[PDB]
Amino acid sequence: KKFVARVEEARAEDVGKRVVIIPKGIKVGDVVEVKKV
Amino acid sequence: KKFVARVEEARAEDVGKRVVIIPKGIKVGDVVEVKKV
């Protein structure tokens, strides 16, 4: 269960969605691979 | 450049943060591995 996506900035319409908060070192625009463990 | 974290619900204080929006299939509470590609 894995996917690829780009980090993005949270906006008012994102409130209520499921997210992983991204830390410093990884910026908006970066591509990340997310895999459920 | 990788980390492990739990999916969480976006709230009003998360507006402005960097996030990956998580799709259906992965829920709040799930542990995921995030790796910059």
Author numbering:
A (entry chain A), B (entry chain A): 6 to 42
How do the authors describe this structure?
Here, we study fold transition between distinct β-barrels by protein engineering and structural biology technique. Here, we discover that the previously reconstructed ancient DPBB sequence could also adopt a β-barrel fold named Double-Zeta β-barrel (DZBB), as a metamorphic protein. The DZBB fold is not found in any modern protein, although its structure shares similarities with RIFT and OB. Furthermore, the reconstructed OB fold could also be converted to the four-stranded SH3 fold by a simple circular permutation. Thus, these ancient β-barrel folds (DPBB, RIFT, OB, and SH3) could be readily interconverted by a few feasible mutations through the missing-link fold, DZBB, indicating their significantly close evolutionary relationships.
To test this assumption, we conducted the reverse engineering by replacing segment 1 of design-13 and design-16 with the 8-amino acid sequence forming the Z-loop of design-2 (the 3rd generation mutants: design-18 (tkoL2_v1.2_Z) and design-19 (mkaL2_v1.2_Z)). SEC and CD experiments demonstrated that both mutants folded and had moderate thermal stabilities. The crystal structures of design-18 and design-19 revealed that they adopt the DZBB fold even without the α1 region (segment 2). These results demonstrated that the segment 1 is sufficient to archive the fold-change from DZBB to OB. Most DNA molecules did not migrate from the well when mixed with the proteins with the stable DZBB fold (design-2, -18, and -19) and RIFT fold (design-3 and -4), indicating that these proteins formed large aggregates with dsDNA. In particular, design-2, -18, -19, -3, and -4 interacted with dsDNA even in high salt conditions (500 mM NaCl). Design-2, -18, -19, -3, and -4 might interact with the phosphate groups in the DNA backbone in a similar way to the sulfate ions in the crystal structures of DZBB.
